[PDB]
């Protein structure tokens, strides 16, 4: 019958053997080890607000060549420090150092986006406004 006990009374084996092999299930383990709560910069949360340290220019990974403009962010809830991308043309002029940006994921479950090495977060709003808004020009960046 290969493997599995087929017995009518062998339920315990069968449920337990499961419990076990579930651990090779990648996200099951992450979920039970609480990897989210433990590692990872965000709290397990969808977003995090934090503060800008330096403006960075990361050269793109092959076979691409460019310079991918990012901000080193120190998360508020957390202290943990994180590099994050400033998307679309310009935008990196909206930021300035020591500003208060809201970060968010990149939709790869961790896992850096593209030709950007080791950045796993993107910017959504500075100084409370929305990057998008500022890009277009529906809105203007606040005071100081």
């Amino acid at each position: 019958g290969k493997g599995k006990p087929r017995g009518l009374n062998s339920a315990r084996k069968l449920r337990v053997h499961r419990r076990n092999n579930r651990w090779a299930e990648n996200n099951y383990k992450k979920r039970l080890l609480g990897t989210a709560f433990k590692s990872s910069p965000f709290g397990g949360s969808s977003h995090a607000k934090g503060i800008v340290l330096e403006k960075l220019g990361i050269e793109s990974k092959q076979p691409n060549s460019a310079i991918r403009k990012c901000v080193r962010v120190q998360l508020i809830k957390n202290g943990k420090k994180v590099t994050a991308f400033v998307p679309n043309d310009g935008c990196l002029n909206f930021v300035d150092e020591n500003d208060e940006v809201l970060l968010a994921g990149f939709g790869r479950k961790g896992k850096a986006k593209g030709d950007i090495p080791g950045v796993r977060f993107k910017v959504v709003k500075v100084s409370g406004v929305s990057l998008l808004a500022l890009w277009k020009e529906k809105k203007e960046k606040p005071r100081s």
Partner: protein, 155 residues
């Protein structure tokens, strides 16, 4: 469990309000009180015959039986006047549409009227809390032994 002595306590053992006037000369000395606990269990004559006191006897004591009637194989007889049976049972795991062996060890009080050895199937009856753990009482012995006198020596 008991056996021997009967009056082997610091306290004098006796049934509550079962007076014997010494003025009135008798041939049985001590008048005894017993009951039929009902539910169809003969009160073994070794409760009536006996001399043990035991206020937790379902036949010669102030405990009363009611509620669950269970049966289990006797698995331990090491505590004075109370044993510990093991009721086993198969349990249904529905994802797998199969069962697994579980069990429980219900501790129960046993009246001198019965003599029990380990392995005997027993039938217990629920009663008031009698101790820290025991909520049942030995009410019938079903087996006997395990064909023990037919395990003897040589021809």
């Amino acid at each position: 469990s008991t056996e021997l002595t009967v009056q082997s306590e610091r306290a004098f053992q006796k049934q509550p309000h079962i007076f014997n006037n010494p003025k009135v000369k008798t041939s049985k000395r001590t008048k005894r009180w017993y009951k039929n606990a009902g539910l169809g269990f003969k009160t073994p004559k070794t409760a009536i015959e006996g001399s043990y006191i035991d206020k937790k006897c379902p036949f010669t004591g102030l405990v009363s039986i009611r509620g669950k009637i269970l049966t289990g194989t006797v698995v331990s007889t090491k505590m004075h006047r109370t044993i510990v049976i093991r009721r086993a049972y198969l349990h249904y795991i529905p994802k797998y549409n199969r069962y697994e062996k579980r069990h429980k060890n219900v501790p129960v009080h046993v009246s001198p009227a019965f003599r029990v050895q380990v392995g005997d199937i027993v039938t217990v009856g629920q009663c008031r809390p009698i101790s820290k753990t025991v909520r049942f009482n030995v009410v019938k012995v079903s087996a006997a032994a395990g064909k023990a006198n037919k395990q003897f020596a040589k021809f």
